[PDB]
Amino acid sequence: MKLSRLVPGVPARIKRLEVSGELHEKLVGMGFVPGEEIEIVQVAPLGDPIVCKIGNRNITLRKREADLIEVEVVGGELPLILADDGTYEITKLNGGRRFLFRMKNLGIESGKKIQVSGRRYYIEGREIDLGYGEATKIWVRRVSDAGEESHPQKLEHHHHHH
């Protein structure tokens, strides 16, 4: 989870910074230190920069730099499109009754263990029609059944360049 994709309003804690030298001192100079609780306030409609809150003050951060800061959702649960990896459990949906209707008929009712792979999610072997826009509306929790196979962890790096 990187703050470059964090839902505006949801607080996340700084795990670590996957960068050192030049940019690292800029980050800590603005407040980016392991332990901080950063919440996104608003995002530029074109993509970035993103305006977040660190130490009460608003910091303007660029995606290139944001992909280096690994954060964690303090809210206890997070949307599919922003999930880490492995097996998850569905906690709640966000939308209208027809939106729910799709989910009920697709297989995501409640408590279901859903797997994350590329741009499609798996309910017990059944692929769900969620790529991005709708995927942020379905919220899940990291359970890790450990019954299925492991995966290569997704660490992200955009250092020094822009």
Side-chain angles (χ1 to χ4, degrees):
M1 161 63 83
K2 268 62 180 180
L3 67 92
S4 59
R5 65 206 67 156
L6 188 66
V7 181
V10 179
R13 187 182 66 166
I14 309 295
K15 297 194 187 76
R16 55 181 292 199
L17 294 70
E18 301 189 74
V19 62
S20 61
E22 292 179 62
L23 182 57
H24 184 267
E25 53 204 73
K26 175 183 178 60
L27 297 175
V28 303
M30 295 183 297
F32 295 80
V33 299
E36 277 297 322
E37 296 175 274
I38 180 180
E39 56 182 74
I40 302 298
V41 187
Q42 69 91 28
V43 176
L46 294 71
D48 74 292
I50 60 274
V51 180
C52 59
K53 287 169 58 190
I54 301 181
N56 191 271
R57 62 190 179 280
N58 296 89
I59 303 298
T60 303
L61 209 285
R62 329 299 157 159
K63 288 204 301 290
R64 63 158 200 157
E65 302 158 343
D67 295 305
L68 296 166
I69 293 69
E70 172 61 44
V71 299
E72 62 181 290
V73 180
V74 184
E77 41 88 43
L78 68 171
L80 282 175
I81 191 60
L82 308 184
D84 176 78
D85 195 87
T87 319
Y88 291 82
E89 178 184 78
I90 178 180
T91 178
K92 54 168 162 58
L93 298 310
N94 287 270
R97 188 174 66 172
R98 289 85 76 172
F99 176 85
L100 301 180
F101 178 85
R102 292 294 180 139
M103 303 307 166
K104 308 183 88 303
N105 284 267
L106 256 299
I108 42 277
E109 295 277 40
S110 65
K112 289 294 188 181
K113 279 58 184 180
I114 188 169
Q115 294 70 89
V116 179
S117 176
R119 292 296 180 186
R120 73 289 177 164
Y121 306 95
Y122 295 68
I123 291 292
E124 303 178 270
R126 172 174 167 136
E127 301 181 293
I128 311 299
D129 304 78
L130 298 176
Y132 185 85
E134 308 297 84
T136 185
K137 305 174 181 180
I138 299 71
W139 294 65
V140 296
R141 309 198 66 182
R142 183 61 137 75
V143 293
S144 180
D145 292 41
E148 51 182 37
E149 59 186 68
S150 183
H151 304 125
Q153 179 58 329
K154 57 205 66 175
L155 299 176
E156 301 172 86
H157 305 95
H158 297 140
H159 58 250
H160 201 227
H161 297 271
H162 57 277

